[PDB]
Subunit: 229 residues, 3 copies
Amino acid sequence: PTMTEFVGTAGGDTVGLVIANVDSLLHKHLGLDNTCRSIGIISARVGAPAQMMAADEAVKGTNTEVATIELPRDTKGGAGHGIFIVLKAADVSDARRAVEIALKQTDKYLGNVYLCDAGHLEVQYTARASLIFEKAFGAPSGQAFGIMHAAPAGVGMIVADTALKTADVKLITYGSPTNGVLSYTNEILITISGDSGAVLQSLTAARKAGLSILRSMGQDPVSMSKPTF
Amino acid sequence: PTMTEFVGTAGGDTVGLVIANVDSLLHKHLGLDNTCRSIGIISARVGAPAQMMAADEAVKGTNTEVATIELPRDTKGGAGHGIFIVLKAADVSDARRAVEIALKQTDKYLGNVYLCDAGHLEVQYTARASLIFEKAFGAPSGQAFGIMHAAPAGVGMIVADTALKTADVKLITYGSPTNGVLSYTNEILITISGDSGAVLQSLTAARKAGLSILRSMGQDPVSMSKPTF
Amino acid sequence: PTMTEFVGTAGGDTVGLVIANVDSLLHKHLGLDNTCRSIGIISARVGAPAQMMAADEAVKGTNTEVATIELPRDTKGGAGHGIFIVLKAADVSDARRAVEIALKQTDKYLGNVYLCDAGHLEVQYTARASLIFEKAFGAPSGQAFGIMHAAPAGVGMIVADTALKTADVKLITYGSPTNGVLSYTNEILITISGDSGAVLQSLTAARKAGLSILRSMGQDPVSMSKPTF
């Protein structure tokens, strides 16, 4: 048969899973307690910001909270993450509902991932960051939010730097291969907040710059899919 | 010729090595001292619990001790570890003898690894955990012991949770991609102790559940080899 | 067009990049300040000591300093690093000049990398270690310097140990998969200093031993390129 805990399935190697009543021995390890022991999972081999985007859309639409967001070091491999998102809810169907949203939206966002032989580029955008990016990055709540990275890390710098030069945006996260923000990926990651117009202007210049460099390197970077802004 | 330090060779990319008299500059870094400076090594590209199982069998049969157990982040890659086991002995032949056992038993245990495109499943069992699992996991000594994980991590949860639900077992280790127990693998790992009957019942349900989910994901998971319980 | 920040391109997947005036929001994160905000980058998917060798040659020849040296966990993958080197300069052309040197020299050094299916061997040498290896390893400044590793880690031990046995050299760095010196690679790394004659004698025996073992494992290890000593 088909196990009730299964849900689907999206790009990268992503699954949606639901656990109705998590064994109490695991409660300590996830955010859980007895009034709240049902779990929604988004887990994937390839990517992380894309799935995070989809999951952030999900919590905005449901009665869920964020138990844990962790990043291997997969991707498959290298040069990026790795995604493991656990949402918690008092009621399984709330969790299931959220997982259903996140799965639906994943492939949409993977459209923002440009792959190629020597690495990748990824630029994500949201107009209201919520619980996901608040927990992952300390994104200013409710504000527009941007996520940047490229591999190898050098390309990531060019991206990161031109993003910040381009417009008036706050630098929320700087992540390098080994500064402890990233799971030893060959990336420079930047996280950005501000007015939508400003954030979008930065993201776009950054995407442009990234592709430019990757091409200069003899690469043919291609989404994925297709982008969202 | 064939270097005297060589020993073989087993599945994954595993070697058995022996060093007769480790240079004293390395003593500080391994557990070593002058009354005890001979080394037995099990090193592999793919897997870790399997080799650990084989090495635990080895120390039970020899006059050896555990210098170090470390896990890359290989596998090759991803989504798992990575194994590096160093056994110490006063006498090289004791170390060699242990390495010989561990190599013989490795492929047997790899039979418990089910591979496939989107990840893997692995369930291991022992009836007397000894020095290896005591050092690696703090396994209750002499007691039956179980090891679980699956990639991507989500599958690992389902496995982990149904194992604990199934029978009356102690939770010894909870490992996620980034909680510091695992080397940024895309896995959830669980470690279990209790009565053999209980442990075996958990392991089997967990294995069943894992395969179920992997299949629901359109995967065809296959050991390896063939399983041991 | 071709972005002014681009430079080339060498083996592994290495790029040379230059940023003229790094955005001040990133200054805190790199070593930077306002009298010194231009950046030279060497970033690659495969290897690290080779590029480090090339970059150390570069700082010896230019008015540059080391902002950051970080190692993913790439390579591609596994079983090694991963390289990300940032040099800082008051003047962009000094940085560019350094990047130009490092790119020219990279492939030369990759000649010291022997690849094969189950892992790799790498032995590097310099007669004056400078700023790179001082920052990365705390190499005794101005002295001859050696770098060793092999994957899987076991081979690394044999290499490391016979190097130290062979001649009168200082042990500067011991790195294992998980002791925190390496980014969870399946390697044992050793770093060595002393008189050139001594260092070269160690490096060569170590290289010999490594290849010996890899071959015993049924591997056909081949540089890369071709070696430098």
